[PDB]
Amino acid sequence: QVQSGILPEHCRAAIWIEANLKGDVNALREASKIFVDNVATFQAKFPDAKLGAVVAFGNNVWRQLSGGEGADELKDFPVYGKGLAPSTQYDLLIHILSARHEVNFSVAQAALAAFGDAIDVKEEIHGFRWVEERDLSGFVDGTENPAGEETRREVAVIKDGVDAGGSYVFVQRWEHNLKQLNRMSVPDQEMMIGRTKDANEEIDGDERPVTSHLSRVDLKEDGKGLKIVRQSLPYGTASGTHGLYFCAYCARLYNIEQQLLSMFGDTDGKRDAMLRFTKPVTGGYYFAPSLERIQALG
């Protein structure tokens, strides 16, 4: 019932396509059914890839496709920090992940053939897992990410009601300035993140700044963690733009939004220390329906 791209772990490569609807919204119903069938065909042809994919929709388009039923938290991605986090809300998100970039490329081509000229592609990002599963900053990223199908489903997948099997998606492309990062001593970079760089040990919450990344995003509400399932990957060229393509799934949009309000100064007026070397340049929220919901579109 869940779309195949939400739960797989340790993907080596991904493709994210963000697009606007040019045509009639009804064009998305047949295209989405064709695409999920193409995904099943590619999984049968390349079982070693561990391929998964997700089709997700922006607020305006999803309200039309669903007739206003469910997806109660869905809204256009707002700016956070009064503009520190910009907003680039589009209508459609396609997320393709697997162990093989070449298979993702064929799947991306099938997605574009299915949607055709009904969409205007705004962004296409090719993610790759880097050496030692580190972010391009040199810090390991995924250590506290929910692990195993059971916990990932608990965090990411809606349990009951009309949206059972669905998930909320957040995508945000960051552009790293590695020259500005390298000007920082390793201990200063470690206090900025909240984990040691080489050994990847958590720095105690009482011993690191409240602006450290972990202090901004490891949030609890009366001891219950506001967890999310991250599928982010590094991207870019060595000589041009590079950074992290942030991607997260959650059964509630609330958990993601509380982390953004914290990181961008809206909650307590303090900003994530990572803003010293990297910045977000896109931002969008989407609703990922269940596979049964996609089949019930036409």
Binding site for ligand HEM (CB under 6 A): 135, 137, 139-145, 172, 174, 193, 195, 213-214, 217-218, 228, 244, 246, 256, 259-260, 274, 278
- Concerning whether 141 is annotated as a catalytic residue, the answer is yes
Say whether 77 counts as a known binding-site residue.
no
Say whether 269 counts as a known binding-site residue.
no
**Among 218, 279, 281, 297, which residue interacts with Mg ion (rule: CB under 5 A)?**
218
Say whether 139 counts as a known binding-site residue.
no
> Residues 18, 121: contact at Cβ < 8 Å?
yes
**Among 99, 128, 175, 209, which residue interacts with its own copies (rule: CB under 8 A)?**
128
> Residues 168, 256: contact at Cβ < 8 Å?
yes
Task: Kindly report each contact of residues 218-225 with a partner whose C-beta sits within 8 Å and lies 24 or more positions away, as own/partner.
Answer: 218/144, 218/194, 219/258, 219/259, 219/262
Give which of Mg ion, ligand HEM, ligand [C-]#N, none residue 278 binds (C-beta under 5 to 8 Å, depending on kind): ligand HEM
> Residues 62, 71: contact at Cβ < 8 Å?
yes
Q: To the nearest whole angstrom, how small is the minimum distance from the Cβ of residue 214 to Mg ion?
A: 7
Give which of ligand [C-]#N, its own copies, ligand HEM, none residue 240 binds (C-beta under 5 to 8 Å, depending on kind): its own copies
Give which of its own copies, Mg ion, ligand [C-]#N, none residue 237 binds (C-beta under 5 to 8 Å, depending on kind): its own copies
> Residues 2, 163: contact at Cβ < 8 Å?
no
Say whether 242 counts as a known binding-site residue.
no
Q: Using alpha carbons, select from 270, 265, 261 the residue that is nearest to residue 209.
A: 270
Q: Using alpha carbons, select from 175, 207, 201 the residue that is nearest to residue 274.
A: 175
- Structure tokens of 104? 């993702």
Q: Which residues pair with 168 in a beta bridge?
A: 250, 287
Which residues of this protein are in contact with its own copies, per CB under 8 A?
Answer: 12, 15, 17, 46, 101-103, 105-106, 108-109, 111-112, 121, 124, 126, 128-131, 237-240
Tell me the catalytic residues. Answer: 141
